[PDB]
Nucleic acid binder design. Sequence first.
DNA 1: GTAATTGC
DNA 2: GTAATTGC
Length: 57
Amino acid sequence: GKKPVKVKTPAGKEAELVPEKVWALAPKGRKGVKIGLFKDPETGKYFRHKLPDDYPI
DNA sequence: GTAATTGC
DNA sequence: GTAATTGC
């Protein structure tokens, strides 16, 4: 389930974007975080950003 | 270092 | 090959 995520673009605007790809980033034995790959919708620049912990992977 | 991911 | 992304 790839629902939109409220993120801040590297331009500095709040935007609800569907991530292109999501995965967990976690050392062994750690909870870690969830990461998404996003494309800025007007500049076209790719960037990574943390996702909420409840986001489906 | 660490964990995975991938556009650059 | 690795910058950049979180958290410890």
